Design an enzyme around this catalytic site. Sequence first.
Site, PDB file in Angstrom:
ATOM      1  N   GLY A  95      31.313  29.833   4.925  1.00  0.00           N
ATOM      2  CA  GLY A  95      32.061  28.597   4.909  1.00  0.00           C
ATOM      3  C   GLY A  95      33.520  28.900   4.676  1.00  0.00           C
ATOM      4  O   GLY A  95      34.044  29.904   5.167  1.00  0.00           O
ATOM      5  N   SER A 152      28.909  36.209   5.976  1.00  0.00           N
ATOM      6  CA  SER A 152      30.330  35.938   5.834  1.00  0.00           C
ATOM      7  C   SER A 152      30.696  35.771   4.365  1.00  0.00           C
ATOM      8  O   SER A 152      30.454  36.677   3.598  1.00  0.00           O
ATOM      9  CB  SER A 152      30.728  34.748   6.722  1.00  0.00           C
ATOM     10  OG  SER A 152      30.122  34.920   8.007  1.00  0.00           O
ATOM     11  N   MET A 153      31.250  34.636   3.948  1.00  0.00           N
ATOM     12  CA  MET A 153      31.594  34.479   2.547  1.00  0.00           C
ATOM     13  C   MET A 153      30.360  34.616   1.631  1.00  0.00           C
ATOM     14  O   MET A 153      30.483  34.977   0.458  1.00  0.00           O
ATOM     15  CB  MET A 153      32.342  33.166   2.320  1.00  0.00           C
ATOM     16  CG  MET A 153      33.200  33.148   1.057  1.00  0.00           C
ATOM     17  SD  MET A 153      34.568  34.353   0.803  1.00  0.00           S
ATOM     18  CE  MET A 153      35.104  34.443   2.495  1.00  0.00           C
ATOM     19  N   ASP A 179      30.196  40.716  14.542  1.00  0.00           N
ATOM     20  CA  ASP A 179      29.105  40.333  13.648  1.00  0.00           C
ATOM     21  C   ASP A 179      28.238  41.541  13.445  1.00  0.00           C
ATOM     22  O   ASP A 179      27.845  42.177  14.408  1.00  0.00           O
ATOM     23  CB  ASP A 179      28.269  39.188  14.247  1.00  0.00           C
ATOM     24  CG  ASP A 179      28.963  37.814  14.151  1.00  0.00           C
ATOM     25  OD1 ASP A 179      30.060  37.680  13.519  1.00  0.00           O
ATOM     26  OD2 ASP A 179      28.386  36.834  14.696  1.00  0.00           O
TER      27      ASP A 179
END
Lengths: 181, 188, 182, 181, 182, 183, 183, 180, 181
Positions: D59, D88-89, D162
């Site tokens: 996010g 991610s985060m 990714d």
Amino acid sequence: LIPTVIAYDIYSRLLKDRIIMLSGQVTDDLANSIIAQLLFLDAQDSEKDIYLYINSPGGSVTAGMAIYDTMNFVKADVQTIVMGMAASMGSFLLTAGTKGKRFALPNAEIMIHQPLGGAQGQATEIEIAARHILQTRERLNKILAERTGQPLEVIEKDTDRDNYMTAEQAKAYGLIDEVME
Amino acid sequence: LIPTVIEQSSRGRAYDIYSRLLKDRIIMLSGQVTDDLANSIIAQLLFLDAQDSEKDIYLYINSPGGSVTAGMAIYDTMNFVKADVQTIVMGMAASMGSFLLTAGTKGKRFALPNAEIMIHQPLGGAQGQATEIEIAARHILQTRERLNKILAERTGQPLEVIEKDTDRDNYMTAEQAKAYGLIDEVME
Amino acid sequence: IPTVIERAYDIYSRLLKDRIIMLSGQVTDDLANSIIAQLLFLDAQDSEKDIYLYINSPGGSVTAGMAIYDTMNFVKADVQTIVMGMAASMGSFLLTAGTKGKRFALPNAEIMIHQPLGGAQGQATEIEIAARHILQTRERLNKILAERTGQPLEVIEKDTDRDNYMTAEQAKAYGLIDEVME
Amino acid sequence: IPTVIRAYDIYSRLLKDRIIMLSGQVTDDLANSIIAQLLFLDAQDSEKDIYLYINSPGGSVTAGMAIYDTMNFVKADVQTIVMGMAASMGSFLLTAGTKGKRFALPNAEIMIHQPLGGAQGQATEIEIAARHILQTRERLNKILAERTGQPLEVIEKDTDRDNYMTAEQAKAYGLIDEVME
Amino acid sequence: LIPTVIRAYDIYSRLLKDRIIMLSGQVTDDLANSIIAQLLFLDAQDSEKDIYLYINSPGGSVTAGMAIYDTMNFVKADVQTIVMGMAASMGSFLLTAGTKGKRFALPNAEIMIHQPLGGAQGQATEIEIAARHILQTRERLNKILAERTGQPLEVIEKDTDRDNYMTAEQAKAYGLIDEVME
Amino acid sequence: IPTVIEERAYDIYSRLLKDRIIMLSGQVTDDLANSIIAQLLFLDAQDSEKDIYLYINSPGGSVTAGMAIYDTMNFVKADVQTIVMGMAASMGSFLLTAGTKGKRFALPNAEIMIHQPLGGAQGQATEIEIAARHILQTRERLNKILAERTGQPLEVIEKDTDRDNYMTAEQAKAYGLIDEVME
Amino acid sequence: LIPTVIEERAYDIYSRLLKDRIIMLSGQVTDDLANSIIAQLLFLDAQDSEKDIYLYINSPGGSVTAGMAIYDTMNFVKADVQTIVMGMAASMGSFLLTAGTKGKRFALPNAEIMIHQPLGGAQGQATEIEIAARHILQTRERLNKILAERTGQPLEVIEKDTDRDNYMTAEQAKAYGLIDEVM
Amino acid sequence: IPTVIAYDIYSRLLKDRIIMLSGQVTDDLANSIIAQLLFLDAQDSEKDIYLYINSPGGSVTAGMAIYDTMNFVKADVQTIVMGMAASMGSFLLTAGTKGKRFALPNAEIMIHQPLGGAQGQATEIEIAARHILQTRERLNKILAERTGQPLEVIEKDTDRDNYMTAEQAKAYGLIDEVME
Amino acid sequence: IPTVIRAYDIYSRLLKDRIIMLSGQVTDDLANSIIAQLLFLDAQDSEKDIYLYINSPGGSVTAGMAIYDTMNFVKADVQTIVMGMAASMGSFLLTAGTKGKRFALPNAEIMIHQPLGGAQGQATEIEIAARHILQTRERLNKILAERTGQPLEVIEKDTDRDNYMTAEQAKAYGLIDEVME
Ligand SMILES: CCCC/C=C/C(=O)N[C@@H](Cc1cc(F)cc(F)c1)C(=O)N[C@H]1COC(=O)[C@@H]2C[C@@H](C)CN2C(=O)C(C)NC(=O)[C@@H]2CCCCN2C(=O)[C@@H]2CCCN2C1=O
Ligand SMILES: CCCC/C=C/C(=O)N[C@@H](Cc1cc(F)cc(F)c1)C(=O)N[C@H]1COC(=O)[C@@H]2C[C@@H](C)CN2C(=O)C(C)NC(=O)[C@@H]2CCCCN2C(=O)[C@@H]2CCCN2C1=O
Ligand SMILES: CCCC/C=C/C(=O)N[C@@H](Cc1cc(F)cc(F)c1)C(=O)N[C@H]1COC(=O)[C@@H]2C[C@@H](C)CN2C(=O)C(C)NC(=O)[C@@H]2CCCCN2C(=O)[C@@H]2CCCN2C1=O
Ligand SMILES: CCCC/C=C/C(=O)N[C@@H](Cc1cc(F)cc(F)c1)C(=O)N[C@H]1COC(=O)[C@@H]2C[C@@H](C)CN2C(=O)[C@@H](C)NC(=O)[C@@H]2CCCCN2C(=O)[C@@H]2CCCN2C1=O
Ligand SMILES: CCCC/C=C/C(=O)N[C@@H](Cc1cc(F)cc(F)c1)C(=O)N[C@H]1COC(=O)[C@@H]2C[C@@H](C)CN2C(=O)[C@@H](C)NC(=O)[C@@H]2CCCCN2C(=O)[C@@H]2CCCN2C1=O
Ligand SMILES: CCCC/C=C/C(=O)N[C@@H](Cc1cc(F)cc(F)c1)C(=O)N[C@H]1COC(=O)[C@@H]2C[C@@H](C)CN2C(=O)[C@@H](C)NC(=O)[C@@H]2CCCCN2C(=O)[C@@H]2CCCN2C1=O
Ligand SMILES: CCCC/C=C/C(=O)N[C@@H](Cc1cc(F)cc(F)c1)C(=O)N[C@H]1COC(=O)[C@H]2C[C@@H](C)CN2C(=O)[C@@H](C)NC(=O)[C@@H]2CCCCN2C(=O)[C@@H]2CCCN2C1=O
């Protein structure tokens, strides 16, 4: 969008030399035009070949079968050349050209798969639609078997999922006769 | 929107401007490369080669690209016709636009001085079952490999350089594109 | 949502007092979080008494499911699974993850197994990365199914190629569950 | 959301035992809740560990950095467990747990990549946005290098696109300390 | 979504018992009203003990922000400000409004300053009124920034002309905050 | 919305109401007006000797909802102090200036705006004439009240409300809308 | 919408103007418009390179690349291209105005001329945004160098003056070097 | 659109030097009007051009393009309003050659100030505000010249929508005669 | 739209015999066409009448007034026949035909009412728009008074709401001269 030459529009000029362009999605409207052109050309002269250039991702099964049946019906031989893409009904019409006269340009993509559809309603209505599409698959596969020389069970395995072929791969498989360089 | 021009002739003529340019063997490839555009270009290329295979064809390009298969249709047609096909980029040739630019007959591929040329990898999309995604992935990777081999041939660059240089959007000047092999000359 | 009575519970909370967890509807991150919290709480409270996980689910997020799966294996308590109505996709996966000998279906339950679903958009490279990822996900789930069912991995691959609906009896025969309960 | 018997909702009952649930997308609202919880728990007792369970696709970078900075601020050690997904985060917060106390459940998916963004407007505005996101990438990568022990240039190659990892792969790489069975 | 802790407080209300106010997300009239109520309540309860205002906000309404700003200055108690994550636009304005010597950033906080944004539609006269108004708004905010930072007004004008992102350390150097806390 | 403990537990706005503070925030609607009015009435019944404090942060809204609040402020025996924080525009500024004279305040950076009423009409010529007469009567009424509240002459209020007119806290004190700027 | 005129030959009005070497550039600069202008420019130069071409411009701008295509074609053709702005020439419109042959760039007295920086967008990974930023900055730098050459202004003046929307009078544009005469 | 014996009706009117300006003033309409004005002047600068106007206005810059072209051509441009001439429509009406600006008896004429919008940073709004104020000032100066009214009267009278009768517009200086 | 044999479209053939068709909504575009036709026909011959057939629900006041003013300008008499409907600006143009030559087919519907409009904004802006539409109603009503012989105050009462009339009622009222069988 569409240039003229001296006075025909460019597509009509090509038609004077017995070339028919089948471009984009196969619909009832496109089919009607192709069919009119095939008929007109055979009336005008059944001893000279017809050339059907194909760049199409497919479309209506029935609209395609109307073209297919009209190709087989005319006395004149129908040559087919794929340029760019012939997928689904596009590849079916490519392989319907007169044997010995079905071509691909060197970087054409050819794709074969199973018919696509939908059914909604009561169980009975869904069974009727299921029977109909399975009968359609079986009829097209039998035609493919005849057009390619492959046995029916091979056509069934090979159309189960999207099956992309090179021009060379399609020649090896029987869909076309020659790659033209 | 599209103006017309008249010709004082002894046999008796009014052309739309694009049709008048086609009389002198010029083809305009403008905007997105679609099946409809490809069909028109192809017809025009075929017609011009029939009319006379000794005289050159001029293909002016201003395009951000479009359909890979529509492009390949045009590419294959350019190579098919007997006549040499000269290519001039004006403004932009990106993606399939740059591929068609560099497909012009060698020695006859040009850019106007402030043209933008861009090369990258093919773009696509797949949705569904793992197996369906695998099929689509294979297909687009095969499409990348085929286009890269052709670029290697058209530019003289080695394949592995083409791979590193198309990994992301790669914008080039007309001079940079001449240096790289995509075109032969910048025309002033 | 009705309430029962001196303490007053909502009906789902009253069932949780007797170690019953309801997994209903789509498997999402929110549902996973609730199920996991309940599994943990019940194991802390007493690891010697069984947990009962009732499942009526068409599936959902693979990763949310895997979170629940991993939690079911982590807790010391046995997790019994009963399917009622439907267990499809990640639902059927969680059904078959129950402790062996304690995986049940009600007689008219529908069980379905298939392959993971997804999407990828962008450059050829990005599509390749996504394709690798989902094929690795298929392989990892199929290996687990092979273990849970006793079927060999290549059978699991042929049988999950397309939507495969099974009866409660067919699922017992296949090894997904242990008993059909009347 | 079920309740358990004082009468707590289940998440509040887990908070009594110093467990914080980070689930779903990292937003300003989620961050505020996690941060409040972290602060509350440290005030209440800084000698006892805090447990942060993570199932998140990522996010907001800044909302994540708010949580990260708070985890480092509080005196108490913060253990992290990924269950399901940390992308991610999410993965950045996973690896920020106190070293020696970062875990994954066996079938957890971990993903690392570069920051994502957009900019619109004048060339100057785009430049400002580009500088900002590049400085954000650089800062995050430096922190990852520290957290993993990997050299910065490895982190740069490995976050270019990714990058999905197994729990075992993530232990090898340095993101986590143990896979718990 | 919001957990409770044991009297039984929701977590934000428990933090308010220790004189902590959370300013999170967009600055709206609603949020301003809540912050203001909290500031007032805390000063009435005890003006000798500090108030702690944690900020994570991308900004919002100028007038809502000014309401919070004016309230911060009104209350007798010192208001400490800590940025965590982001303080942009009116967020950074409220950060720097904390009592001098007690304005903090966590190490990886982002601070952003820029000019006010707006719109006007209509007759030339109506557009002139709106332009005069937003320019007067810019000038008033910039004067207060000058005072809060020690930078001269013309430096504040050059530096807010476009989006200006700062590190915690850069913001300390510039005068927006006093200390970076590790 | 946070809660605070005294053991009694109030939501923060209700705690403020215990001390005779009413929050008027956001757009003036029939719903907001109903709440404000209920609170004003309750507070006066409870004790008419102690003042009521009305904090205002509002861009305006319904003229008739505003007039309901205005009329209630004048009705109650207790003095109604008004403090603007942030913004008081249109009906917001009208309610600000309606506070008891001597007890109308602005925080130092408050924005105050006055203008003419806004509206719309659609239909037959006759219907539009009816609507026009009505909004012009509304303008005339509000302007008379503003003249009384500010001490400005009517003709000055007319010129000054012709277009959007933004004022500083100090400018609004000079104009008569408020009594003091509070630092 | 578009009237026709007789001479035994019947032209649409734009085609009649093209017979006298006038090209209309109206509205947004797109690939379609650029293709038409370019065709017309080439046709006119083939037909006679000794006689001037007249390019009337009323445009708010559009595609940078489409514009550059027209620019490059204007420089390519042997014939001198005069440019007249009528109404508006903004962004790529003003760029094309100033690309006319020097000494033959005009504005009608009440024309508006606007210059600014290129506009764009970028979305995605940090790397992708950097690529896009580099590209648009290179585009700005290229256009600014050309403007420096076309106007006589030094490059650093062009950079300050295109930072934000910069509207100019016909006379201001003559002073600045974008055009030669106001007619 | 009917035909007469073979011209379309608008083309037949253009053979007699009549130009129809109908509807909103856009870049497309301006382009057509301008082409027509230029063509007619080239063909014969000694014979008048007749511009019939029924328009609620539109783009200021498109309008100014037409205005500047009317003044450029050597031929006198007569203007007749029929129905409406509002905003840029009235501005073009009053730009016709003095002594040859007409209104049909029941025409509506309206003058006001320019309309616009701006969005963004304070600086961007300032730029836009300066621009539209300069546009107002320029148009007002021209109106002053065209009407004979003093500038300060034009400013008061264009502050809000100001509808005039054909007779009122003659008295004001916008037109020369009402034609019965 | 059919053609008839020189080859005219049917409307152009009727225009050769001085007939103008005013059909559907009165817009700026329609007005421009009608006006051009009126002008053309008067230049061609001012001694022979023009026939204006009307079937219209009304539309723009200003567009209608443009047609009205043009009908009065041209030297030639303009006869008007309503067929089907003439409402609002349609009926206004019907009654503007030369007196003695205004007709209705027996089953035509004629309707008169007041102008319609809208205004939004400041009190001042609404007053301007109200004054303007009331001045428009007064100007149209005066012309109706003159055209029908009814006094102005009767016209005001009778246009206050939608007022549908028969061809015979419209003759009685003065809007038309004769009903043609
Ligand atoms: C109602 C209140 C208690 C709620 C139960 C939480 C719980 O059981 N968490 C799992 C970890 C886990 C989380 C998850 F989301 C999914 C999952 F499948 C597994 C857990 O660790 N259980 C422990 C007991 O709890 C702990 O040790 C602590 C304290 C507790 C408040 C929360 N600790 C943890 O999250 C961690 C980090 N666990 C440990 O530190 C120990 C040490 C080595 C790593 C794993 N640990 C254990 O497995 C302990 C040792 C004995 C068995 N052993 C649990 O049951
Ligand atoms: C928790 C308790 C709070 C309830 C208080 C309501 C209240 O104060 N109503 C106002 C009227 C009012 C209503 C409104 F919606 C807006 C507004 F501006 C004013 C009121 O009348 N206050 C009276 C005392 O209360 C009453 O007499 C009662 C009883 C009460 C249950 C509600 N009455 C009323 O609604 C009415 C109609 N009041 C009266 O009938 C009396 C008698 C003569 C007519 C008006 N009245 C008064 O003015 C009384 C006498 C003088 C002052 N005088 C109040 O303050
Ligand atoms: C109505 C019919 C007129 C069509 C006009 C075409 C034309 O003028 N093309 C430009 C090139 C150009 C293309 C473009 F898309 C944009 C642009 F700004 C410029 C052109 O090169 N003109 C030549 C003379 O014409 C040609 O030689 C021919 C023949 C004609 C059928 C079309 N040739 C061309 O397209 C090209 C590619 N020109 C050439 O091949 C010659 C030979 C070497 C390469 C470049 N050439 C020139 O530069 C010639 C020699 C000197 C200047 N030099 C022209 O002006
Ligand atoms: C004013 C008329 C313009 C029409 C020009 C069409 C044309 O040149 N088609 C290409 C084939 C092609 C089609 C396509 F869709 C894309 C593409 F890139 C290429 C072509 O074949 N040209 C031939 C000469 O023309 C033909 O022989 C005929 C007759 C013509 C009316 C259309 N034939 C064809 O479509 C086919 C199938 N070509 C042939 O039959 C011959 C025989 C063996 C197969 C291929 N052929 C050729 O290549 C001939 C022999 C020598 C070179 N060789 C052409 O250039
Ligand atoms: C939990 C209960 C909270 C009650 C306190 C609220 C409060 O602190 N209001 C601020 C004014 C204010 C309002 C606002 F919307 C925003 C803002 F930034 C500031 C306040 O005035 N505090 C006073 C003490 O409170 C009061 O005097 C009273 C009584 C109380 C019920 C609410 N008064 C007010 O609203 C007003 C109008 N204040 C005053 O009347 C006095 C007299 C002159 C004007 C300002 N006043 C003060 O400053 C008082 C005198 C000493 C310092 N001095 C406060 O701290
Ligand atoms: C197919 C070709 C025929 C085109 C016919 C147009 C036409 O009849 N215009 C009306 C004016 C008008 C315009 C309009 F938009 C609506 C409307 F109701 C009336 C007209 O002027 N009729 C004149 C004869 O025409 C002219 O004199 C000329 C030349 C012609 C090409 C068009 N003139 C005009 O537009 C003007 C400006 N008319 C005049 O200049 C003369 C001089 C004084 C002012 C008005 N004029 C007349 O009325 C002339 C004098 C005798 C009667 N008298 C017409 O019938
Ligand atoms: C320049 C004009 C171009 C028109 C081309 C028409 C044409 O080719 N029709 C196909 C039938 C057909 C229709 C269709 F919609 C799709 C399709 F694939 C095929 C045809 O049969 N042609 C005949 C020639 O004789 C005809 O009767 C033609 C003449 C034409 C004016 C219309 N007839 C027909 O409609 C049909 C249906 N023909 C017949 O019915 C005859 C009679 C018995 C049944 C089958 N027929 C034939 O097979 C005839 C005799 C031998 C072959 N045999 C044609 O080729």
